[PDB]
Design a protein around this ligand. Sequence first.
Ligand SMILES: *C/C=C(/C)CC/C=C(/C)CC/C=C(\C)CCC=C(C)C
Lengths: 61, 339, 578
Amino acid sequence: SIAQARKLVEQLKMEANIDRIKVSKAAADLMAYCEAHAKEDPLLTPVPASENPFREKKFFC
Amino acid sequence: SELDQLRQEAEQLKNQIRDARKACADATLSQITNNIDPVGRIQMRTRRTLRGHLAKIYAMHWGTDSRLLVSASQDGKLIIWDSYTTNKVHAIPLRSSWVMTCAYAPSGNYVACGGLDNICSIYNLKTREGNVRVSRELAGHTGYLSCCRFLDDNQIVTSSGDTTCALWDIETGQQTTTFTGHTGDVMSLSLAPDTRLFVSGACDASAKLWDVREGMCRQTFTGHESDINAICFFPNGNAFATGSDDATCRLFDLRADQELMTYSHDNIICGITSVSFSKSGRLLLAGYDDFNCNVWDALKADRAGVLAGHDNRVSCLGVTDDGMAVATGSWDSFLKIWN
Amino acid sequence: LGACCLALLQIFRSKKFPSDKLERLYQRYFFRLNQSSLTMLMAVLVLVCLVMLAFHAARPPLQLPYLAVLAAAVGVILIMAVLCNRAAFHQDHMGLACYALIAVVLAVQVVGLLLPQPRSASEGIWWTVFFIYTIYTLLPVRMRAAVLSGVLLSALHLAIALRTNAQDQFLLKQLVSNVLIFSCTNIVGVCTHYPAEVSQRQAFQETRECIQARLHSQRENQQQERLLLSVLPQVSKEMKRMGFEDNPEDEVDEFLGRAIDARSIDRLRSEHVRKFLLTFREPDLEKKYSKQVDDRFGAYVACASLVFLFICFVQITIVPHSIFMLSFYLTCSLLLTLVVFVSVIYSCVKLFPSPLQTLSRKIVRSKMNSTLVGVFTITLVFLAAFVNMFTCNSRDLLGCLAQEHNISASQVNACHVAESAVNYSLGDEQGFCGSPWPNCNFPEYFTYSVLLSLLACSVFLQISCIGKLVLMLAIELIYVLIVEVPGVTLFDNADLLVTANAIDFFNNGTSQCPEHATKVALKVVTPIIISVFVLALYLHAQQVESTARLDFLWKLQATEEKEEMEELQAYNRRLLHN
Ligand SMILES: *C/C=C(/C)CC/C=C(/C)CC/C=C(\C)CCC=C(C)C
């Protein structure tokens, strides 16, 4: 476990040497992606039952 | 000693990380979203009940056409359906009574399954001589298989309980790249749309980010107080969600490298079973062990609605690639589609 | 003599399953299956109401309340059909929808029965019989409600005919025959409803049987498997994920409900059955279904023999006794009694000698032999309905009055007939104009007898709908040809005489009759009535056959999934043993 700890050390060396981003910037970007892809979302913008395979249904006589 | 000089070095590196993180914790997702309106009551109604499985359902996977889908069950059968028609495409008796996962080739030419057998059995559905026959057995893992994902028709990634995950050159049949590091059973993994990174979760109370090309751990996420039973990526690929026995679900962003949101409730005491997003992601769906499944406003973490049609843990789920409907598999032998 | 009556009183106890939850789940299935039957019923009743409207509208004077009530009845029935066709109509109200329809039919019947002109005890029998039979066959009402409605409709018809027609000397013959007709229709309706309600209750209980056996055997395999894997090796999280951290009827009813929900019926029909032929698309499915045996044929034969006795009593009461008629009926009675005996021997195999036991088993085990006997029986009943008509008079009275009155036929009205009323009246059974043959003044009772024979075709529930259609169309074609081709002189003479009798002949100082036939020529009415009955009977047969085939298909899927489950259990048990 001696070389194992050394691995843990140089691994934290890797992790601590990353460039992070402010939560505000990231969240704004995520919210923007949601907004740009909210219009395409059928579950938020229901489509005509005709187009939906699971809603197509009608018959009388 | 040097262990205590590195354990305290580690403590000061965790602290250093806690410093930058708390420095980047300028605000919280909950405060920013306090202003956005709730998604409302999301009351999707079951539209197709897929039965034919004889016992608990463990895994399923849609076809890239969003019409066919594979499912696995305790009945020792793997069923492929025609969702538009629900007609069964292929019934596959299995070699073992315990399969934990299943998967579909994006092209569909092949499928794969596995479990405690330590073998991921790939099945050919379009054999030149018109048959459905086993076409490959991926052996080498020394633990039970928990999740697996292809990279191409010749490469695939699998996760095992031996503390190792492995990428296989299927034509070779041997591990092309190894992804070790977890100190607990790896449960699930999710590839990125670019198919260049992927995240894994384990019982070691740590989730890790791996570069598929490299294979090393890039980021480690924690916070849970128990083994991470599930994990899911955000649709855009800069974030992902996690689920644990700690009775919470949490959101992490790759660039922020910290938790954004937490999902849980006080009247909720049962554990969650499976999770999924809407096409835009505003909604977060989550199964529950109390026979229920709760729908949450993912941007607001408010329980939009409840999908309670099962009498037992809702084992797994998944939304169609186009977002048309949602499938849920359960121990009641019933798969339920919602919309 | 008394134990049979006590057993009959035991028959009138409405069978009910003990669980109100199970009864609700059965009702949800039964209502989903019969929503189309209820809407077809509404559509056929609309057709019949339009037919009644055309018959009354074909002849003035148009009574405003009759037209208004029929238009309102049509409107209500159409509104109810549209509401019941909206998916949002709660299934618990379908029962009420059926009682409202009876009330509409009652309202249609009351206005149907009070207003029609000219008055006859034969008027409106056809639509009354239709509505009664349709309520027995197409209306899904409880036996007590069906019986109360049929008896009420019968007594109300009889009471109306008694109130309006109190002055007719021959009233007793018509009234007795109408009583006989309504008794027969109430019986035959009981004998049709009860076996259907019984086989449907039996098939549902047998289904709860097999479903219970499947679920029970799964349940036994479950605890097995549980303790199995338990021992086999914290229950590791892998083991907990495998599904172990260690009222059954309510779990059965919920799982069964989900399967009922997931197994769409119109879809299974369109996938596994050919839309038109109704044969199973797989020949092996049809061979399995053809091995399914019926058991109650002899009760239907007994009911048909009782109907035969009622037909005989009607014919003997209305039709003068002829040695030819009595000998033909005796011959048919002996043949029919022989056929009843041969059919009943299957129920009483132990009491008869070996060759008869073998014949009876070979018949009932042979759907073909029982079908052939049913067809032969019906053909004899149809023949009995008109062969005696060949002993009815056929001399032309109208050319005879033309020679006596020396007037043109196109100028003959009921007043010119009434001036010569002394020589030719409905009361004379001596063949007028030196004819040796008696008059048969009420041929519609042959049609009603044929309707009863057509109603008798309804009773043979298992004759193929195409086989029934061919037999019923042969009955229709032969009888319509006999009413139209040979009977036409008899009908024109009877319509003329009946028109004169409808006239309350009094101090008619002037030859100014109320005029107007006031009635649609019965020769024209009979074909339309028969075709309408054949259509309704075809639609009923289609619903019956579609139901029996659907019940078979779910019982088969239940058995195939059970066999598959027993195979999977036997395999896993072998592997555990292995
Ligand atoms: C789809 C809804 C309706 C009401 C369609 C009705 C269609 C039919 C064929 C019923 C009408 C039946 C007749 C007018 C009877 C005519 C019979 C002959 C012309 C022989």
